[PDB]
Every structure is written in structure tokens, then in C-alpha cells.
Amino acid sequence: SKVTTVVATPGQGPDRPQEVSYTDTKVIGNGSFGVVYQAKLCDSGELVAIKKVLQDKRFKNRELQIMRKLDHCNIVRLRYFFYSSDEVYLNLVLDYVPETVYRVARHYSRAKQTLPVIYVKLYMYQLFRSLAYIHSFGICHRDIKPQNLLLDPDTAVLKLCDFGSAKQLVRGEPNVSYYYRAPELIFGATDYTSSIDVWSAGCVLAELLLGQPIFPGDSGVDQLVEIIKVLGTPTREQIREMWTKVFRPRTPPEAIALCSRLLEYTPTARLTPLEACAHSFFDELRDPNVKLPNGRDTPALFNFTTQELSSNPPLATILIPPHARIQAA
Ligand SMILES: O=C(Nc1cccnc1)c1ccnc2[nH]c(-c3ccsc3)nc12
């Protein structure tokens, strides 16, 4: 009922802007960092989300540059990107996903219930996969939160999105400090590793089990007070670097043991995406007789690339089970 034809450039491939048309535009996201709309392309009818951010010709949009080099089933797919209006607005046309870990987590909280563990595995595992993949590029998201984890209810696939706050960390360079904030950040680190993403993911896993934020605090103070109110006080040693009673009864040991190896004061002490993916908490996923709670076949959880594994290839023995190979032969 209201078409909009623009000159868009494919997200992947040699810059060759072609004409693109879309309609049914319906706002669905808001903030000071931009705004996300929904819309349907006219030649395919496919649904998409358009993220509109204000960019100035002085420099290049870092989030655009990062998105353009990404391509993984567990990261929001970029279709096109174009500009609008003096004031320049960059629009990112993404493959639309209907829900988020935030809207789902909240939907379970209003029922005093908790998201079934099978779903927690499925989501957390794919998150670690998206992490392992981008970290191998040296790229750190730097802002993992339930709002940023999109998911499709009927497929049970999670896709990381929102790289407006992400940066390709260059080991050997200063990073200015400007409830998922890792402690090293609270202490305004300047050389922190991409292991900050692991801490945040840890808060998310924890949260999904709990059923509410784990480290609630309006400031680093209150926030850090929580971290201590659960992880206790740090040692002079850890300070430089920078239980089972905490989680609800009946919480699978593997889950509680997994959160303990992610929520460590020492960045280097924490697991890495790849290791996390292979943690026994996800053993059930590597099971041949595993059943997707939805019936449909489980999403491609073992199609790892040499890139996703570069962090430590031999770990492929675990991440890719016997049946996964014979079935992908
Ligand atoms: O990019 C997206 N969202 C976003 C969120 C926060 C900051 N920047 C972008 C996005 C891309 C594709 N499909 C999407 N679906 C949704 C969504 C669906 C229900 S609430 C949010 N958000 C997206």
C-alpha cells in the first residue's frame, strides 16, 4: 500500500548497487542508536528488518564493515544496505527473525515458569558458535544481551545481531572504556580480550536458568556488588588479572558447572566459544537419538568450518559426533 524503491547494494559480493523495492513498512524497534522496521521485498515477498542509523560522511560505519565480512548461519544475515536522508542515514536490510531471547525469557517469567533446558542448550550452543566464529576474526561483539539474540520459534535457530557496538580487536592497541558487563570492563580495562563476550554469554545462560538477570545493578558499583554477592570477593591476584546453592533446585549439574567456567574473574580462566560448544552440557545435542522439541529436524549444529575450529581443531573430535560425519559424507 506504500512502496519504496531504493538503490541498494548486496551485503555480500562486489559492490554493485541495484534497484530494490519494499513495502508493508512497520516500525518494530526504537532508541537513540537508530530504529528497526519490518518490511516485505516486492520481487520475493520475503520479510526483512531495516535498521536505520545516522552516519556522517566523515568516516565509515564500523558496523557495516563488520557485517559485510560476516557469513554464518548463527549470525543475522545482511541482504542489502542503502542510504536515506542534510542528514545521511544508513539502512541495513536483514533477513527477518520473529523473536528474541529477551521477549521469550520475559514471556516465561510472567508465567512464573522457566524455559525448558533443551531449549537453553539449543540457544546457548548456537550463541557460542556465533561467538567462536566472529572471535576467530578477532572481532568482539562487546554487547551481548537477550535483546541481541534473535531466534525463530519454529526452527529453534538463534542468530546474533546488533554489531553497532562491535570492534575488530587489534591485540597490542588501546581500547577506551566507553548487567552483562564483564568485571574487567567495570575496572575500565584498556587491553581486555574478546573474552568479554564469554562473560556476557555466561550472564545469559545463568539468567535463562534463574529466570531473571543475575547481576542486577544500575551502575558498576551495584553491579559488581552482585557479582560479589554470588562469586564472592576477588584475590589480589585476580584483581590484577581483571555456588550450586545459587541456582534453582533441579538445575542440571552441567549447566551450573558451565556457568562457573564462564563467569570467572580471570578472563584467561574462562572457556572460549569452541570449548563452551564442546562442554558436556551440550552432549545431548551431539546425541544421535536427540529430538528437536518442535519435531522439525534440528538445525545444522555440527557443520563447523576450518575457521570456526582454528581456535583448536582437535576439538572437532567432540563437536562433530560419529553420526554427524557419516550423515554429512
Ligand atoms: O537487527 C535486528 N534487530 C536489532 C535490535 C537491536 C539493535 N539493532 C538491531 C533484527 C534483524 C532481523 N530480524 C529481526 N527481528 C527482530 C525482532 C523481532 C521481534 S523483537 C525484534 N529484530 C531483528
Q: Any idea what the CATH number is for the domain that residue 89 is in? A: 3.30.200.20
C-alpha 84 – ligand 1 centre gap (Å)? 19
In a domain, 10, yes or no: no
Number of other residues whose CB lies within 10 A of the CB of residue 185: 18
Determine phi and psi for 298, rounding to 5 degrees: -60, 145
Question: Is there a contact between 4 and 23 (Cβ–Cβ < 8 Å)?
Answer: yes
Q: Count of H helices and E strands in the chain?
A: 12, 11
Q: Is residue 29 marked as binding?
A: yes
**256 and 178 share a domain?**
yes
Question: Is there a contact between 179 and 199 (Cβ–Cβ < 8 Å)?
Answer: no
Question: Is there a contact between 311 and 136 (Cβ–Cβ < 8 Å)?
Answer: yes
**160 and 228 share a domain?**
yes
Distance of CA 161 to the CA centre of its chain: 6
Out of 80, 98, 116, pick the residue that ends a domain. 98
The SS3 assignment for 82 reads: strand
- Rounded to whole angstroms, the Cα distance separating 258 from 270 reads 10
Resolution in angstroms, to 1 decimal, for this deposition? 2.6
Report the number of distinct structural domains present in the chain: 2
Q: Is residue 33 marked as binding?
A: yes
Out of 32, 66, 98, pick the residue that ends a domain. 98
In a domain, 14, yes or no: no
CA distances from 299 to 119, 174, 249, 286 (A): 12, 39, 30, 12
- Rounded to whole angstroms, the Cα distance separating 304 from 320 reads 8
- Rounded to whole angstroms, the Cα distance separating 20 from 186 reads 44
**203 and 280 share a domain?**
yes
C-alpha 49 – ligand 1 centre gap (Å)? 7
- Rounded to whole angstroms, the Cα distance separating 215 from 203 reads 8
Angle between helix 196-210 and 117-135 (nearest 10): 170
In a domain, 6, yes or no: no
- Rounded to whole angstroms, the Cα distance separating 32 from 53 reads 9
User: What residues contact 230, with CB distance under 8 A and at least 6 apart?
Assistant: 214, 215, 246
C-alpha 52 – ligand 1 centre gap (Å)? 11
- Rounded to whole angstroms, the Cα distance separating 77 from 49 reads 10
Q: Tell me the DSSP string of 110-138.
A: TTT----HHHHHHHHHHHHHHHHHHHTTT
**153 and 179 share a domain?**
yes
Out of 98, 124, 139, pick the residue that ends a domain. 98
Question: With b meaning 16 or more CB within 10 Å and e meaning fewer, what string describes 208-246?
Answer: bbbeebbbebeeeeebbebbeeebeebeeeeeebbeeeb
Angle between helix 196-210 and 253-260 (nearest 10): 150
Tell me which residue has cell 581486555: 192
Tell me which residue has cell 565509515: 60
**164 and 272 share a domain?**
yes
- Rounded to whole angstroms, the Cα distance separating 324 from 320 reads 6
Grid cell digits, residue 60: 565509515
**300 and 222 share a domain?**
yes
User: What residues contact 134, with CB distance under 8 A and at least 6 apart?
Assistant: 70, 72, 75, 140, 141, 160, 166
**Range(s) of the domain holding residue 267:** 99-324
**Ligand 1, CB cutoff 6 Å, lining residues:** 28-29, 36, 49, 51, 76, 94, 96-100, 103, 147, 150, 161-162
Q: Any idea what the CATH number is for the domain that residue 126 is in? A: 1.10.510.10
Nearest ligand 1 atom to alpha carbon 98 = 18
Question: Is there a contact between 158 and 126 (Cβ–Cβ < 8 Å)?
Answer: yes
- Rounded to whole angstroms, the Cα distance separating 54 from 14 reads 24
- Rounded to whole angstroms, the Cα distance separating 313 from 195 reads 19
- Rounded to whole angstroms, the Cα distance separating 168 from 124 reads 23
- Rounded to whole angstroms, the Cα distance separating 11 from 115 reads 34
In a domain, 251, yes or no: yes
Nearest CA to ligand 1 atom 9: 162
**149 and 271 share a domain?**
yes
Question: Is there a contact between 93 and 8 (Cβ–Cβ < 8 Å)?
Answer: yes
Nearest CA to ligand 1 atom 7: 162
Grid cell digits, residue 246: 545459587
